[PDB]
Amino acid sequence: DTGMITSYLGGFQRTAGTTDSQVFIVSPAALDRVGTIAKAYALWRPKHWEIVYLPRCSTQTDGSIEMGFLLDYADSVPTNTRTMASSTSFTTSNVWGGGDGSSLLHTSMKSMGNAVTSALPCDEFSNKWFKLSWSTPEESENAHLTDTYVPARFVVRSDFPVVTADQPGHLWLRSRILLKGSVSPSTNL
Amino acid sequence: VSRPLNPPAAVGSTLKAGRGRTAGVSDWFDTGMITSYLGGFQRTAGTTDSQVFIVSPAALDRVGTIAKAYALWRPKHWEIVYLPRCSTQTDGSIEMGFLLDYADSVPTNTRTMASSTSFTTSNVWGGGDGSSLLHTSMKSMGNAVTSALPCDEFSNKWFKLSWSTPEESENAHLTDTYVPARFVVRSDFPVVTADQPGHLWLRSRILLKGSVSPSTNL
Amino acid sequence: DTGMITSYLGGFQRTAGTTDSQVFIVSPAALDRVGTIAKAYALWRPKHWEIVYLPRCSTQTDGSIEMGFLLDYADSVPTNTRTMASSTSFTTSNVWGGGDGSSLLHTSMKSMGNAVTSALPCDEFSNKWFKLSWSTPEESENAHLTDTYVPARFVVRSDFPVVTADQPGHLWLRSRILLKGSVSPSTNL
Amino acid sequence: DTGMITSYLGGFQRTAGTTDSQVFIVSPAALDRVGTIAKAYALWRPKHWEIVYLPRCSTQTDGSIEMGFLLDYADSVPTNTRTMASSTSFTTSNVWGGGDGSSLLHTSMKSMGNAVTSALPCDEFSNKWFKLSWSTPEESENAHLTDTYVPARFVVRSDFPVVTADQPGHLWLRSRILLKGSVSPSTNL
Amino acid sequence: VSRPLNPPAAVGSTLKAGRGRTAGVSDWFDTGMITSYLGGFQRTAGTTDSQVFIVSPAALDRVGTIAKAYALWRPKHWEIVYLPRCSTQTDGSIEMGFLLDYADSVPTNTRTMASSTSFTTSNVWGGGDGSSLLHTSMKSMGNAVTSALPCDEFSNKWFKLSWSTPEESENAHLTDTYVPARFVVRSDFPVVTADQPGHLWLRSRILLKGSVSPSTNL
Amino acid sequence: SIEMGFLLDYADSVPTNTRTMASSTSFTTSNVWGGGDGSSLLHTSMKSMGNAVTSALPCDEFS
Ligand SMILES: [Ca+2]
Ligand SMILES: [Ca+2]
Ligand SMILES: [Ca+2]
Ligand SMILES: [Ca+2]
Ligand SMILES: [Ca+2]
């Protein structure tokens, strides 16, 4: 058991003229510390996987951010807000809100207050062991196949198109996972 | 030790579905007060510009597919709540209301919009208190900016669930027979650059009645 | 439940190439008895899968044997001692020893003495059922897909590349599995 | 222990001009699933061996079926009904009856109702272990010898000659047996 | 005044015999301790000469036909009692015993006979007290000359009732599978003129199991 | 239909028609698909009833 670990997931990017839509595969692979530790193991299971958004913009900034999870790799990614609002653990807030979530990064408290978070319901995987993968899914790979080793996908969206591109905030991950099975990091793919 | 046998000429049965459910799904359903996303408040450059939302279960994303298994429906509550998400330096206001006759024209100015049913207006950064109304059955209060369709006019009517959108060629009088009403949102302040200062949330409750095969439901 | 059963897995083959390692798929398919019995069932679960190495050579034979498991079909096969050592249930020993393991073939006790064994940690599958397959994984089959019906792969390699090919010992498997769901043997693929 | 297993024993054939008389040796050998499983074992013991007849003909069809067991391989096969009626577990019914026995094929209930079944009293073998045999007894083999490895014989008869041959019903077997002793399927004869 | 009629398409039944009796006869039977005549003790001129009796229900005259209605049987008790009927001036003795393996050879002298199972011997005019054992379940006592087969070895076995006698061509090992044992009686005193100094009575008890048509029983 | 009965004198001839058969001892007759209720009489000591088709020899003459 790794315990709760905080990882920088990436920034919240807003490209001009189009509504942003970043998709993150739920895997330790890319995480600075977790990714490294995980490489020495063959299997893993998510116990807690919650993303907390922290703003870095001015209160004058317009727009909101929308977050949620997709549990079937075959399901398509939401293109509008109404659709996004039906996803798992949907959360939305002004692009400048969420500052109260700061403490969640070094604590284990439950998201509360004006915190902007979205947590993957991990009860779904309490009996499964996923094989740790370090490669990106092929374009040609059948969705049903990918779904077998991808717990879920995390989606981040912008509610409306901006004139000028910017990065309103940061996406942080609080995760706790179980690692099992011995393998050489170099042979772990 | 020995048992008699007396087969019938033929064997069969008589099925009559209808406990109060057909094919495993109730024949009657009440959603209760629910909350879902309606759409964003979009501001543009034309003055005439206004957004129109047809009152229909199709507006509910998840509830939509459920409704597809029923033949009739009735609006028990349909109220829109405006939630601002912008700087208090934002100029302009928002105007909302309902049109009860599909034939009536859509308002193009404030004077006219003000006469719509359950009309309500407010500066675009007002209505913050409305956020507490979401997911709850509480009643409007605070600076909450809301507009509720008086559903008492439909308490005896049963609308047929229609899944296709009204055509152009369709006579307004005909469309009016299956569309309870239209919700209209207008901006009084034309803007240079399009933006979305707030959002529109829907607090509704509908009744679904009558069993029907989803695929045959049109 | 089949109970414990001993099966001849094959011989330990030493050759001239270095990246020469034998790979066995964890499945009842090829087993003399277990294979026949399993044919009448649709699903299975490994409760115990342990390989015991037994010598058949002179005490003058140099070199050692290395065994271990790969839990992800996508992981690559170790090519040197350093990385083989990181496989699951890794074990190693000189090529002519391991006699204390012979009794493990009719007993159910645990590996002790100079016995050379490698037991797959089956607690990993305690909650799932695999569909019994009798065909060999296609060449073109996506590793991720093969992984879905292959519990694990067992790997055996030499550290001492030899001049003349030989067979220093035998690989014995003592397993115990659960079978579930009926199906006609001739229908079982 | 195999537990209760359902096997297709064969159809009930009626040849024209002569009263049918099919004889089945009580052995797992020919059973689709049991036969396969049993091949990996050397010994067996019948705990439950009951045949249930299921009709597939019209209520207009004439005649009845008669079933029973012969416990001594030397005893001759019944040629008429009165004689057949003295065999072990004698059962007889219209060729179109027995439809209520359907449920017995996936249950473990005792035959009841209008079910047409005949069960071998297995208490007789509670202390014996028979050697599994896959060959048919020689014509020349002494009956007393055959009797040593054949628990019993199941006999099916037609009560009267039909004009046109037909297959009025199916013969199903619910069996439960104990298997013991390890052997290679290929060397098991 | 009027009764409805609704005939079936056909009529029939399902028979399953087996209360614990088939065709009017029990499927299980215990004879209890019974007494019957086995044979006479015949003395002849050869030394090798000995009488052999195969343990089988066929040895029971009346019980025999009854057994024919059953498929299996088991010896629970099989004891022979010798009853002398001769002058006390008669020389010689009698030797009796059982052979448990049909392959084993028949004893031809005293030294060898003495090693048979449940061996017993006595002067030909001895054993008078044995007459009280007949028809009763009493246990051997007095000078009673008896020999009892230890039936504990058959307590788990069920023999198939065979009515034909073993052939010559039959391999002893095969015969042994359906013959519980052989009882042997020998004279140690070869005589000039054949005579019969005593008789052999059988005190037995057997179990019969399994229904079968007597005529098909072989 | 079916007709059954007993002949008490081995000398008497066997009936060849219905009129004659009807006079046999414990005579009884019925359509060939009748008598279904009789199946309950088997293995029991119950007495004939229902549409049961039976014929019993008056054994009092042999007492
Ligand atoms: Ca891997
Ligand atoms: Ca419709
Ligand atoms: Ca299969
Ligand atoms: Ca065999
Ligand atoms: Ca017999």
Cα gap D66→D154, rounded to integer Å:
11
HEC profile for D119-184? EECHHHHCCCCEECCCCCCCCCCCHHHHCCCCCCEEEEEECCCECCCEEEEEEEEEEEEEEEEECC
Q: How far apart are CA B177 and CA B173, in angstroms?
A: 7
Residue B10 contacts by C-beta under 8 Å, 6 or more apart in sequence? none
Q: C89: helix, coil or strand?
A: strand
Structure-block tokens of residue D20: 């049918």
Tokens 């009575």 map to which residue? E201
Residue partners of E160: CB distance under 8 A and separation at least 6: D71, D72, D73, D74, D147, E71, E72, E178
CATH architecture of the domain with residue range E1-218: Sandwich (2.60)
Q: Which residues of E touch D114 (CB under 8 A)?
A: 14
Residue closest to D124 by CA, chosen among E68, E218, E71, E32: E71
Q: What is the DSSP string of B36-84?
A: EEEEEEEE-S-SS-EEEEE-SGGG-HHHHHHHTTEEEEEEEEEEEEEEE
DSSP-assigned states of every residue in chain B: -EEEE---S---------SSEETTEESEEE--SEEEEEEEEEE-S-SS-EEEEE-SGGG-HHHHHHHTTEEEEEEEEEEEEEEE-S-TT---EEEEEEES-TTSPPP-SHHHHTTSEEEEEEETT--GGGGGGTTS-----TT-EEEE--GGGGTT--EEP--SPP-SSS-HHHHTTT---EEEEEESS--SS-EEEEEEEEEEEEEEEEE--GGG--
- Give residue C182 CA to ligand 4 midpoint distance, Å: 24
**Secondary structure (3-state) at C47:** strand
> Using CA atoms, how far apart are residues C102 and C94, in angstroms rounded to an integer?
16
Residues of D in contact with C38 (CB under 8 A): none
Q: Do D113 and B7 touch (CB under 8 A)?
A: no
Looking at beta carbons, which residues of chain D come within 8 Å of B7? 59, 96
Rounded to whole angstroms, how far apart are CA atoms E201 and E38?
A: 5
Task: Please answer yes or no on whether F36 and E15 come within 8 Å at the CB atom.
Answer: no
Three-state DSSP at A183 gives coil
| Spacing, Cα C133 to ligand 3 middle (Å) | 5
Give strand pairing partners of D49: D120, D175
Is F5 in contact with F25 (CB distance < 8 Å)?
yes
Tokens of E163: 């009515």
Note whether A146 and A137 are within 8 A (CB). yes
Q: In sequence order, what are the residues at sequence separation of 6 or more whose Cβ sits closer than 8 angstroms to the Cβ of residue C63?
A: C14, C94, C95, C158, C159, C160, C162, C168
Sign of CA dihedral C68, C72, C73, C79: negative
Q: How far is the C-alpha of D174 from the C-alpha of D122, rounded, in Å?
A: 13
Q: Do chains B and E touch (3 or more CB pairs under 8 A)?
A: yes
CA-CA distance, A143 to D71, in Å (whole number)?
61
CA D178 centroid distance within chain:
18
Which residues are CB-neighbours of D31 under 8 A, at least 6 positions away? D5, D7, D38, D173, D175
SS (H, E, C) C65-79: EEEEEECCCCCCCCC
B188 phi and psi, to 5 degrees? -95, -10
Task: For residue B4, report the phi and psi dihedrals to the nearest 5 degrees.
Answer: -70, 150
F50 touches chain E (CB under 8 A): no
Contacting B residues, span 7-36, partner chain D, CB-CB under 8 Å? 7
The angle subtended at Cα B184 by Cα B181 and Cα B189, nearest 5°, is 170
User: What is the total residue count of chain B?
Assistant: 218
Instruction: Annotate chain F with three-state secondary structure.
Output: CEEEEECCCCCCCCCCCHHHHCCCEEEEEECCCCCHHHHHHCCCCCCCCCCCCCCCCCHHHHC
Q: Cβ distance E149 to E75 under 8 Å?
A: yes
Ligand 3 mean position to E196 CA, how many Å? Answer: 78
- Residue of A163, A159, A153 whose CA lies nearest to A66: A159
CA distance E61 to E69: 14
Extended strands (E) in D3-87:
5-14, 21-25, 41-55, 64-70
DSSP state for residue D1 in the 8-state scheme: -
Strand ranges across the sheet with C21-25? C21-25, C153-158, C64-70, C88-94
Strand, helix or coil at E110? helix
* CA distances from residue A164 to A97, B41, D71 in whole angstroms, order as listed: 20, 20, 95
The helices-and-strands tally (H runs, E runs) of chain C is 3, 9
User: What CA–CA distance (Å, rounded) separates A142 from B150?
Assistant: 50
At residue D2, what are phi and psi to the nearest 5 degrees?
-75, -30
d(CA D146, CA D154): 15
Q: From the CB of residue C40, how many other CB atoms can be counted at a distance below 10 Å?
A: 24
> In whole angstroms, what is the distance from residue A93 CA to residue C88 CA?
46
Which amino acid does the sequence have at E27? D
C-beta separation of D129 from D43 below 8 A = yes
Q: Which residues pair with B148 in a beta bridge?
A: B79
List of chain A residues whose C-beta atoms are within 8 Å of the C-beta of residue B36: 82, 85
B175-193: b or e for each residue (b if 16 or more CB lie within 10 Å)?
bbeebbbbbbbbbeeeeee
Structure token digits, residue F4: 């059954």
**What is the distance between the alpha carbons of residues A122 and D77, in angstroms, rounded to a whole number?**
68
Q: DSSP letters along E7-63, please?
A: --S--EEEEE--SSEETTEESEEE--SEEEEEEEEEE-S-SS-EEEEE-SGGG-HHH
Sign of CA dihedral F6, F10, F16, F21: negative
Structure tokens at F58: 């008056």
Beta strands in chain E (DSSP E): 12-16, 21-22, 25-26, 28-30, 34-43, 50-54, 70-84, 93-99, 117-123, 145-148, 159-160, 182-187, 195-211
Torsion, Cα of B6, B8, B12, B13 (10° steps): -70
- Cα angle at C54 between C50 and C55, to 5 degrees? 155
Residues B195, B210: Cα–Cα separation, whole Å: 43
Residue A91 pairs in a beta bridge with A67
Q: List Cβ neighbours of F44 (8 Å cut-off, separation of 6 or more).
A: B1
Q: Which residue has the tokens 């009489």?
A: F41
Contact check, Cβ <8 Å, B5/D94: yes
β-strand partners of C91: C67
3-class DSSP state of C23? strand
Q: Which CATH class is domain A1-189?
A: mainly beta
Q: A112-122 burial, b for 16+ CB within 10 Å, e for fewer?
A: eeebbbbbbeb
Q: Which residue of B has its CA nearest to D113?
A: B3
